Design a protein around this nucleic acid. Structure first.
Lengths: 312, 336, 129, 315, 278
RNA sequence: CUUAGAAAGCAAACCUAUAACCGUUCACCGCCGCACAGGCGG
């Protein structure tokens, strides 16, 4: 049967800032003189390449661009999605290194186990992130070659340079996947085992899920129900896993928690900053995905229906 | 039938050994993305949308919940829906590539050289006891004084400061000295040691003898010898060992951990970068490739088959999925 | 060395000649001269014009001397300066290095054409080719 | 694991006045009147400026260079880099960092340089992130123009050069002090943040000098720098911590005030131009999204109206 | 420690003249029309060329002498103000004016800042000018005036020095300062390690530290040259009429430019000693 | 469920000091005198 309800929570983020917060590193470039400069650091540029053309066959050397030859409309500034995710969950950046089979209980009952996803070292336990983020792509392009130096030194190793930026305005799109968010596989059948379990542990784990999700919004009534065989709704498949499914209120809490963190996101890094200015949400119950991207008018800001239920 | 997938910010690299088309082992897949691994042969992997990547997306879109290598093996169902159509699907990829360096995470190892966490234990009893001076002083003698000490000589006035760093530095120097030929005046201190310590041999492939293997075995002597003058329990582990120092050499990180509050220093990750020297081009660097664009999949099937596929999608209600790795890929247009 | 520095030197060399020689019948002329110093000197003695020196009755040193003699008011200084800087000599000049007074000073030269000598081969009456 | 409240950052808006360019970019290849390229025209720092016109010709691959006089000081204005601003804010200790080693690093930490400015020690890789953040000091008047120069008496080849110079200038900028980065000082290599390496008893001693220095800023206050072997960041699930020093609210208040006071008196004499900070408006931000003073100026709170946020707890 | 006393000697200059003293250079406006020095001026309009990003030119008659006024550059003033190795130092050029010597890492920063001499009466219409009235400001830095670095430690060496040569150079400095004003007791002292106030390691450099009366004579000589400044050029002239001075003992400079009531025309306190000997 | 799943290039740094766009670097220092009179010496 057709799956109905909210499939995914789409959104379009507009951030503001000043300067580069996510750097790419030193690149081999040539100056206005023709000689190659060693250390000129470049930020992350969409589709940028520091090569122009080839040279004679018996050398194979590739000609390098000038450090001042960049078009921020063709190759704009952006913040890697890898950096954005790092700061959305910055408080738990090192926790996964201390995650093991024993304490995996605590990794799950948390924003990292539910939203970030996670991996368990030396284990086959996983959980794919239900949050999907693009890169934050600048719209203003106020970049330019900036020369740097060191006081009290004139030698060649004293002077460095960078491609720096002034005011920035990023735009990005994302989606919260309900299919990934509401179900939690505890079965090694499909290699999705969020954790290895003994019989009877299904009900206790749901309570800890329940407790933590309840602690996100006490005004709501979440529900985490374990079952030995959860099967997907609309498939031609008759095989399921033992897992945990959150009711509609539990899902309403996690979605609202992530949207808040995205709304309050801010990055201070590399002597530059960036904060999330505006965020536009779409509770997509239609068949077309990323409706917010192609057509911004068919958007529905407030939750107008129950979230889709993907498992029996 | 054409299905047009648009994506953005997808990773075009892979860091795991083995393969994803077979069950994942007990301990997991070996991670080959650290600094040392990438230098060696073929650990640096670049990825393009192959056939498998297009099938896993077609199954995913019809709601399947079993690893693609399981759907191909008809593992938990009767038939594989695409077994007939797999020879009937083509695809054109239209990416825009970007080279950035990403700090990836490593989930096992730790650092030894210049690596410790917490406070340096400079007050540990092994350094602040009465036996402490003429015990570590064995590591300060030159090689001539040591060889005469090994022959029952009770004189070790060689005084140095007692603290983890200076000791590990003195063991660094003594480990950096050249090897020595098997002389006849050396052969006797080899009889003395090998009478003390039979089970181990002080030799290399071709009759060489490392100086550090003698300073350490001499320190075990000092431990056994002094056991009559003072109480050494604070200088040994349980079962009469020396922490981080074997009779053949020394283990640095083990020594430093024992004398630093706080665990060993973990390597949290490393940047995805590989610098090789390639003739003609000088030094070329290799980064992580990120792709953004659209991917057009076309299946040559009857229009009825197309309509059956299109409604199997709507039946499953999938939406917004990654593409190969950590992307944002949706379905933008479907042509029957 | 350029057209500007060699003339200044040869003019001082010529100046010290008829000082130790102490002559008054030797002069100077500039054929290839035009809106600037000439490139070819033509000494006359042993084409009917006359060459003469030109200098102003005003100087920075003279104003400083007035302020020292007590003959200048604060508004007198301001009116003295307007007159000194106001006058401009288009006449050809030389910047004569010196050692007796240790100063570099500018000397100007004027002429009168279609028709006895001071230390610098110039005069206010003596005719020259 | 409770939510963190209080002042999270101290933002501000800086207004400066000056004359002439204080921070230069360097020589740039440009084309002059007649269309023939000039080799030495020095340009100041112009935000968003590029010296290419974006035009190429007939498979040459050559890229057209702008005219030395083609500049719109409204669309790419003059600015003073943060690197130059920071150098003059701490100009008294401009060279002290080069004399830091594993023996005297204790003194580098207890100083305006070790606490507000950053530092990286190349020999031991000890570091500390600067909790101070400065935007560009952007000119508002744009009294710029192409100026030609010459050399006395040289009158040969290369005796004449040119620059894009400025007259009266007025700069406006924003900044922020990170309380999280400012209140905690890591002494552990566990998280690659080791400000310095310590022996067992050395932790408490370093804090004493930390406290002593902060005390001298305002004798009226009671600052505290407390060492603990396990300081944990708020929000972790396994509560893993590091050796470090945490400053109470009075210590944070002193460093916050000393910086603003130093910023208020900032003046730069350089390159034959000057600039002095005229007015400064401050905002003690208790919301999460920083730079509140930037988008809405009515919500700012000029005074310390609450305690500073505590991002770390002992264990 | 904390620095007190006078930190700088600011002043406002008012000059008079006529015509253009300082020109810019050749300019294409089509024809070659040599424009003087106008602040904020540009000879480019808002039109662009085809197949090239270059822009069309202006006409020689489109200038607003109130929007882009006339000024005499700092580089021109510094030429006619000083108008004139072991001997370079110990002169007006080596102490007040700066210098760099090619083929040598020696240099000294000029402690004298000078703004543009900006015209107030926009009398313009080659393009020639009538009566001109200039205004300007300026500052003398005591830190950059009182200390003479003879050390390559921070790349500040005003002169490569060998052992023993220190006290000889200092004595000659003190002699030239003494000649400016014999009624004063200037001092030019040499030390192998002069530390600036405010450091944490008290790392020093060998140099020469002038005393209070030595700064006094040098400040008086400079202000004296500025009040008697006067430029004669083929196309115009200028001369300094009046000049107001403030001995700034506050931190922020140009106190005379933001509030003319707080200035002190006289030296009311000792100069500030930015350096001490360790 | 696809390249199994999670993944900061991070921390620190003055493009700095000197230079008429121009008549030939240069209207200079001093003396007689009440002189913003006229001259003199180099």
């Amino acid at each position: 049967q057709k799956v109905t309800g909210i499939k995914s929570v789409d959104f379009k983020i507009k951030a503001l800032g000043h300067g580069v917060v996510n750097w790419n590193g030193p690149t081999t470039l040539t100056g206005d003189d023709g000689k190659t400069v060693d250390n000129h650091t470049l930020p992350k540029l969409r589709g940028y390449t520091n090569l122009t053309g080839k040279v004679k066959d018996e050398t194979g050397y590739k000609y390098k661009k000038q450090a001042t030859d960049i078009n921020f409309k063709e190759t704009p500034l952006y913040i890697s999605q890898n950096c954005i995710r790092h700061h959305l969950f910055r408080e738990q950046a090192f926790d996964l290194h201390y995650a093991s089979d024993k304490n995996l209980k605590n990794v799950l009952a948390s924003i990292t186990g539910l939203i970030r996803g996670y991996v368990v070292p030396s284990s086959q336990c996983k959980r794919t992130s239900p949050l999907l983020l693009e890169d934050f792509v600048d719209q203003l392009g106020n970049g330019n070659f900036e020369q740097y130096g060191q006081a009290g030194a004139r030698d060649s190793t004293s002077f460095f340079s960078k491609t720096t930026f002034g005011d920035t305005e990023y735009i990005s799109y994302g989606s919260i996947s309900i299919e990934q968010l509401q179900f939690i596989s505890l079965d090694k059948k499909f290699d999705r085992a969020a954790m290895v379990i003994k019989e009877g542990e299904g009900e206790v784990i749901a309570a800890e899920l329940q407790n933590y999700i309840q602690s996100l919004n006490p005004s709501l009534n979440p529900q985490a129900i374990f079952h030995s065989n959860y099967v997907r709704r609309g498939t031609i498949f008759e095989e399921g896993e033992c897992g945990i499914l959150l009711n509609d209120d539990a899902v309403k809490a996690l979605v609202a928690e992530t949207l808040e963190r995205l709304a309050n996101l801010s990055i201070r890094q590399a002597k530059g900053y960036m904060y999330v200015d505006d965020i536009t949400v779409d509770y997509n119950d239609s068949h077309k995905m990323m409706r917010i991207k192609r057509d911004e008018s068919e958007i529905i800001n407030e939750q107008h229906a129950p979230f889709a239920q993907y498992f029996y | 039938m054409k299905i047009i997938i648009e994506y953005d910010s997808c990773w075009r690299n892979a860091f795991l050994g083995g393969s994803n088309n077979e069950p994942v082992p007990k301990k997991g897949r070996e991670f080959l993305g650290s600094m040392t691994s990438l230098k060696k042969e073929g650990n640096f992997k670049v990825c393009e949308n192959t056939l498998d990547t297009v099938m896993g997306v077609l199954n995913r879109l019809i709601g399947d919940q079993r690893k693609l290598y399981q759907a191909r093996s008809k593992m938990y169902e009767s038939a594989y829906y695409f077994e007939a159509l797999e020879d009937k699907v083509s695809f054109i990829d239209k990416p825009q590539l970007t080279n950035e360096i990403s700090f990836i995470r490593n989930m096992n190892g730790s650092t030894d050289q210049n690596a410790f966490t917490g406070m340096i234990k400079v007050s540990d009893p092994v350094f602040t006891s009465e036996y402490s001076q003429q015990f570590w002083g064995v590591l300060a003698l030159d090689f001539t004084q040591l060889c005469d000490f090994i022959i029952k000589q009770s004189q070790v006035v060689g005084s140095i400061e007692l603290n983890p760093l200076s000791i590990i530095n003195r063991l660094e120097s003594l480990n950096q000295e050249k090897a020595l030929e098997n002389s006849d005046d050396l052969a006797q201190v080899l009889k003395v040691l090998n009478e003390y310590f039979p089970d181990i041999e002080y030799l290399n492939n071709k009759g060489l003898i490392t100086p550090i293997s003698i300073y350490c075995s001499a320190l075990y002597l000092q431990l056994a010898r002094l056991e009559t003058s003072f109480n050494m329990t604070t200088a040994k582990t349980k079962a009469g060992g020396i922490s981080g120092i074997s009779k053949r050499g020394f283990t640095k990180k083990d020594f430093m951990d024992r004398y630093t509050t706080g665990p060993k220093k973990t390597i949290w990750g490393n940047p995805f970068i590989k610098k090789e020297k390639i003739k003609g081009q000088g030094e070329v660097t290799s980064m992580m490739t990120k792709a953004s664009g659209q991917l057009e999949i076309s299946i040559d099937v009857d229009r009825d088959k197309a309509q059956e596929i299109k409604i199997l999608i709507e039946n499953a209600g999938v939406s917004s999925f990654y593409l190969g790795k950590k992307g944002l890929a949706y379905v933008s247009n479907i042509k029957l | 060395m350029r057209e500007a520095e060699l003339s200044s030197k040869v003019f001082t060399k010529f100046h010290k000649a008829l000082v130790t020689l102490n002559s008054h019948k030797i002069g100077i002329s500039f054929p290839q001269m035009k809106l600037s110093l000439g490139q070819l000197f033509r000494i006359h003695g042993d084409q009917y014009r006359i060459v003469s020196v030109k200098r102003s009755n005003l100087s920075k040193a003279k104003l400083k001397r007035l302020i020292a003699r007590g003959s200048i008011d604060k508004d007198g200084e301001k009116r003295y300066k307007v007159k000194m800087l106001g006058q401009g000599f288009d006449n050809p000049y030389l910047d004569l290095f010196s050692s007796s007074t240790g100063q570099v000073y500018r000397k100007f030269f004027e002429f009168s054409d279609i028709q006895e000598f001071d230390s610098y081969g110039l005069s206010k009456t003596a005719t020259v080719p």
